[PDB]
């Protein structure tokens, strides 16, 4: 017997790693990650503590996984929809300020510089290219901010010019030196080869206002659009913009925008129909195949079984593209065969209906193994004596299938089918790679095509359409199509 003490021991031991890692998350700054990990671990311990929460012991590991990698992402995606997180507004405010404060402008002259040893101290040479004058400092030591008086010279320095290596090692201390020309100009290191009058483009006023030290123009945070705009607002706006909250703006933008709504309904219908036909054809093709391949009279079954899933064992990406080549209207071996036998050449990309047929053929090829494999397993739950009964009732194979096999499978297949509908609803990748959504829907102001799903036409708006990649718009649409497919599971 593994001790009864051993339980309250391991539970105390793990309940200690919790804290050691939680208060340790409270440090530096990881607060969202501390609150979240507290509720999750505490639920874990209590659940394994009192034997009244027994059943949860079985659910908790799985639900924890799900919350972590399914739920949490969903929450952020929704969260993002209430902000203008995009290509144009990608940085946090703090980061954008930090970028603007790293910006520089050349205020004065530029001098190539040299580093020369004087015993165990150093000497700094500058060379004024534009006058042919040369300057050299007194012997100094490295370390901290220091100012150096440079004097005009005609002589070479005594030391041998230092390496790039030596310049590099001393780059920190070197970058802290302010050199002063005879004529009163300050000059600091701007590269590994040059000292110059490089200066910070903006200064932080501390009340929020950034002011340009070249134009004199002034800028404040405008948290309405997420940019530094001039000052009461001016006409000029500084990039980079920052991410900022926009309430309902991305959700309305889909409802307010006449023109992105012209083909909505018509594309929606096609997506519903595409999903339904796919699910139907894949469940039906897969179920039959699974039935045939468990039939003990069928002597090739073990081999057939393997070969029938290969469309799922190869990654779909190459396959889709090979299908695109296969379906080429003038070339491509399908229409070259339909040329010979049957004498026709279907317009698989040019013609809306034949394109849709193509897409459904390809999808069924991709999706039948999945439904097959499920059925291969589900079919084992049907007891064999039910077919002895059916035999004694005068049943044939066809009758067996429809009165016993199909009704006994559709129940456990129902959730898998509803899910396959939702997945195929959003099957962005297939349409993009195969048809790009074409052929073209004529007169669509924001461009749409006949085989576009809802996802394909919508992400065209958010990610193409020329405004850069609008993550907020896309998140909001993702939520909207989610609340739509959720209401379609009615």
């Amino acid at each position: 017997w593994q001790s009864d003490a051993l339980k309250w021991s391991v539970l105390g031991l793990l309940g200690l790693l919790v804290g050691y890692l939680v208060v340790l998350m409270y440090a530096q700054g990881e607060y969202l990650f501390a609150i979240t990990t507290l509720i999750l671990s505490s639920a874990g311990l209590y659940i394994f503590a009192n034997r009244k929460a027994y059943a949860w012991r079985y659910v908790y590991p799985g639900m924890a996984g799900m919350g972590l990698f399914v739920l949490f992402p969903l929450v952020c995606t929704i969260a993002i929809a209430f902000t203008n997180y995009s290509s144009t507004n990608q940085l946090t405010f703090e980061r954008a300020q930090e970028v603007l404060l790293d910006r520089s402008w050349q205020a004065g002259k530029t001098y190539n510089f040299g580093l020369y040893p004087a015993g165990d101290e150093w000497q700094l040479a500058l060379s004024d290219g534009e006058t042919g004058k040369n300057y050299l400092s007194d012997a100094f030591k490295f370390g901290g901010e220091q100012k150096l008086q440079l004097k005009e010279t005609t002589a070479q320095p005594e030391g041998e010019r230092a390496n790039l290596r030596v310049i590099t090692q001393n780059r920190q201390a070197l970058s802290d030196i302010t050199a002063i020309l005879p004529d009163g100009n300050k000059v600091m290191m701007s590269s590994l080869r040059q000292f110059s009058g490089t200066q910070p483009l903006y200064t932080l006023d501390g009340d929020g206002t950034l002011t340009n030290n070249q134009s004199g123009v002034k800028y404040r945070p405008n948290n309405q659009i997420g940019f530094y705009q001039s000052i009461n607002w001016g006409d000029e706006k500084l990039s980079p913009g920052y991410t900022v909250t926009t309430g309902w703006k991305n959700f309305t933008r889909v409802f307010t925008d006449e023109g992105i709504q012209k083909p909505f309904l018509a594309i929606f219908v096609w997506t519903v129909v595409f999903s339904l036909i796919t699910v139907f054809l894949t469940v039906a093709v897969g179920m039959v195949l699974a039935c045939l391949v468990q039939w003990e009279a069928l002597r090739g079954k073990a081999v057939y079984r393997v070969l029938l899933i290969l469309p799922y064992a190869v990654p779909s990406f190459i396959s889709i593209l090979i299908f695109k080549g296969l379906f080429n209207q003038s070339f491509g071996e399908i229409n070259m065969m339909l040329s010979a036998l049957f004498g026709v050449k279907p317009a698989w990309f040019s013609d809306p209906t034949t394109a849709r047929t193509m897409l459904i053929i390809v999808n069924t090829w991709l999706g039948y193994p999945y439904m097959m494999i499920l059925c291969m397993g589900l079919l084992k739950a049907i007891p064999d004596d039910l077919y002895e009964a059916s035999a004694m009732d005068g049943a044939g194979p066809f009758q067996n299938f429809f009165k016993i096999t199909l009704p006994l499978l559709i129940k456990p297949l129902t959730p898998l089918m509803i899910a396959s509908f939702a997945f195929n609803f959003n099957n962005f990748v297939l349409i993009q790679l195969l048809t790009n959504g074409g052929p073209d829907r004529l007169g669509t102001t924001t461009p749409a095509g006949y085989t576009d799903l809802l996802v394909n036409y919508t992400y065209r708006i958010a990610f193409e359409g020329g405004g850069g990649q609008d993550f907020g718009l896309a998140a909001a649409i993702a939520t909207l199509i989610f609340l739509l497919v959720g209401a379609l599971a009615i």
Binding site: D385, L386, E388, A389, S390, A391, M392, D393, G394, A395, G396, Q399, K403, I404, P407, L408
Partner: protein, 358 residues
């Protein structure tokens, strides 16, 4: 339809579950299979169904070979030992399943379903699924499913085993009613002796996969061919005693009890057999057998008494009508009638009884 087997053998690889079985069942005959648990009753029945393969031998149904014909094409129907109900289907839907298959006529179906469910007292359960039924109720749905289909041959495997006594009585009757009205062949498996006796035109006794005997109910009861049948037909079991002179038309043997009485038997190291119902009160008979009472079972209608006799290893079971007040350890005496005695050879076979029974 008629059904006949011809040198039918059945092997599970090398375990023989049916050996050389030969049966002629004539159209309209009611045949019952009896035999010990695991002797091959359901296997035989399943071979007729086509749910099992015949290894060697011929099977014919209505004068045509069926070995190779599949179950669905034999014109047969079966009540399964384990019922084998459709779990997704209601009682009504289970019962109407066969009919729905071969020419569904809405009203015809409803009618024959309602009628059969009434005699099976299932009318209030028509809408339930099999999981919401009792064991006996499920057994009757299985029956209903086969009766409704009206096959050419009815196969019924222990179809009343989980019904109460009074309902069993009623079901036998209805099975009989239907056997006279349809005049189609019925093959019926049961462990109940009363059902075997009252239903059967023929009883086929089975032992470890081979046919021990075939005959009329009363034929097997009065005239069993061997020790096994004798001990299998009629319950309580026929008593056995290990029994010098041999007349030219009857046999004489000696009782093993230490007095060594000698008695004649109207027949052809023997075993003598006498049924508990055939033993007589002490005062009547010539041959008296006396020992100690071991077990007394009060059945209400009758009393059954087990008696340990000197030098006789096996207890002796006695049946006597009405409530007899006898107690364990008491002395009991009974009469051994010679004309009602059976006799069995060293191997097992019976010496044909010549006393004519009514």
């Amino acid at each position: 339809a008629s059904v006949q087997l011809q040198n039918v053998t059945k092997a599970w690889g090398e375990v023989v579950v049916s050996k050389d079985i030969n049966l002629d069942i004539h159209e309209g005959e009611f045949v019952v299979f009896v035999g010990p648990s695991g002797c091959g009753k359901s296997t035989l029945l399943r071979m007729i169904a086509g749910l099992e393969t015949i290894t060697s031998g011929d099977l014919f149904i209505g004068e045509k070979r069926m070995n190779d014909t599949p179950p669905a094409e034999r014109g047969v129907g079966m009540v399964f030992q384990s019922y084998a109900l459709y779990p997704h289907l209601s009682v009504a839907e289970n019962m109407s399943f066969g009919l729905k298959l071969a020419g569904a006529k809405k009203e015809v179906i409803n009618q024959r379903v309602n009628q059969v469910a009434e005699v099976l007292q299932l009318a209030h359960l028509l809408d339930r699924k099999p999981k919401a039924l009792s064991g006996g109720q499920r057994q009757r749905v299985a029956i209903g499913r086969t009766l409704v289909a009206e096959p050419s041959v009815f196969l019924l495997d222990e179809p009343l085993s989980n019904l109460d006594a009074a309902l069993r009585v009623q079901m036998r009757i209805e099975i009989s009613r239907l056997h006279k009205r349809l005049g189609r062949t019925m093959i019926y498996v049961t462990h109940d002796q009363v059902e075997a006796m009252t239903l059967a035109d023929k009883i086929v006794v089975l032992d470890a996969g081979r046919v021990a005997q075939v005959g009329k109910p009363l034929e097997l009861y009065h005239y069993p061919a061997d020790r096994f049948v004798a001990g299998f037909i009629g319950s309580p079991k026929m008593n056995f005693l290990p029994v010098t002179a041999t007349a030219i038309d009857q046999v004489q043997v000696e009782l093993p009890m230490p007095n060594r009485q000698q008695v004649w038997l109207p027949v052809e190291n023997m075993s003598l057999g006498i049924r508990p119902e055939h033993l007589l009160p002490s005062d009547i008979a010539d041959v008296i057998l006396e020992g100690e009472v071991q077990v007394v079972e009060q059945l209400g209608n009758e009393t059954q008494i087990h008696i340990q006799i000197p030098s006789i290893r096996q207890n002796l079971v006695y049946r006597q009508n009405d409530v007899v007040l006898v107690e364990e350890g008491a002395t009991f005496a009974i009469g051994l009638p010679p004309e009602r005695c059976h006799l069995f050879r060293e191997d097992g076979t019976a010496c044909r009884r010549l006393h004519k029974e009514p």
